[model samples]
Structure formats: C-alpha cells, structure tokens
Target chain A: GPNKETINREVSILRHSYQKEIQAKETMKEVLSDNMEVLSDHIVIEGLSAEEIIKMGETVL
Target chain B: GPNKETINREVSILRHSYQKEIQAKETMKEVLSDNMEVLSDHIVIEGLSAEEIIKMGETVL
Candidate 1:
C-alpha cells in the first residue's frame, strides 16, 4: 500500500515531464517554420551567402 | 502549383523530423526510467554516498 503512493508519484512526475518536453518541441517546430520564412527572405532579398545562412540557422538552436 | 509541391515537401520534412525527435525522446525517457531503477537499487543495496549517486545519475544524461 505504501509503495503504491510512491509509484503514483513517480508516474505523475514522468507524465508531467513528458508533457513539458513535448510542448517544448512543438514550440521549437513552430519557431522553425517561422524562421524558415525569414531564412528564405534573407536568401532572396538580403543575398546572404550559403555559409552565412547556415550560421544564422545555427543561432536558432 | 509549384508552391503547393514545395509546401508539401516542407510539411513532410517537418513531420518526419518531429517523429524522429519524438522517438529519440521516448527512448531517452525509457533509459531514464531504467537508470532510475538502477539508481534506486544502488542506494538501497550498495549504500552509495549521495555525491556518488549524483555523479552516476549525471552520467546517464
């Protein structure tokens, strides 16, 4: 009976942690798409070199 | 019509990337659980010092 409480606590912690990580990744993907637009604009309008574009992308991570 | 194809390609890439990342994190969570078991066993059976246990946990990450 006592072990049940501890096990439940662990599961709650694990579930919360998983949700937090998943939320973070979803945010990352959205930001990535937004940045993709910016990247394309930079390539077309600003004429950033390929290397410069890659360096800019790396800064996002 | 061509823009549709590019958008589709980007969506496919994004979907694939998200799945890959999610899978990696799932694997990491499993490993973390397994390591947690090991950590608990070490604490109970071996009487490892707190600092040693912390170091062992750090190595997993």
Candidate 2:
C-alpha cells in the first residue's frame, strides 16, 4: 500500500506557497497604501487593476 | 528623492510569490485528479470545498 508520506510533503509545499503569497500580498498592500495618499492627486489612477497599479508604481516610485 | 529601486524589489517578490502559488495549485490539481477516481468511492466527498478535499486527500493518500 502506498503511504501518505508523499502526499504529506506536497500538501506542505502547497500550504507554504499559499502562506508566502498571502504574506507578499499584505506587504505590498501596506507599501502601496502608505504611498498612495501622498501620490493620489498627482497620478491618474482611476481604472487600473492591482497588477496594473503595481506596474505604474514601479515606473513612478 | 526615493528611487524606484526599493519598490522594484518588492514588486519582484510579489510576482515571484504569485508564480509559486500558481505552480503549487497546478501541482495539487494534478495530484488530486490522478488519485480521486481510485479513492472517490471509498470517501464521503459531497459538498466539500477545495480546501476540504485537499484535507481529505491528506488523510487518505
């Protein structure tokens, strides 16, 4: 019988990956919110999606 | 003037995180599909969310 050992390793990887993603999202969210208010009036940022906004910030920051 | 360098590094981190997340999801999806048919009949898997299904797999795999 194949054991649960291999599946356990994959599940751990999946969970760790999700954790990293969530942490990165929160970190970026903080960085953007901290800067957005100061830059809001100067930037034309009405309809951009999150990735688009990130790109714009990359260009301007 | 704060340069775009720091923001660029953070964006890179965010992008890398997203990539890892996507890869993990695909890997898990493949693993589940490969095993589900064999295990489906033995399991009580109705109305379970994806996370729940993953947990069940963790137990049985």
Q: Each model's TM-score, in the order given?
A: 0.35, 0.31
lDDT of each: 0.53, 0.52
Which candidate number has the best DockQ? Answer: 2
Candidate 1 residue A31 C-alpha distance from true site, Å: 2.3
What are the RMSD figures for all models against the true structure? 22.1, 24.4
> Highest TM-score, which number?
1
Candidate 1 DockQ vs. native: 0.02
Tell me how far the alpha carbon of residue A23 in candidate 1 is from the true structure, in angstroms, after superposition.
0.8
- In order, the B-chain TM-scores come to 0.53, 0.51
- Candidate 1: list runs displaced more than 4 Å: A45-61, B1-61
Worst 10 contiguous positions by lDDT, candidate 1 chain B: B37-46
Report the Cα lDDT for residue B6, model 2: 52
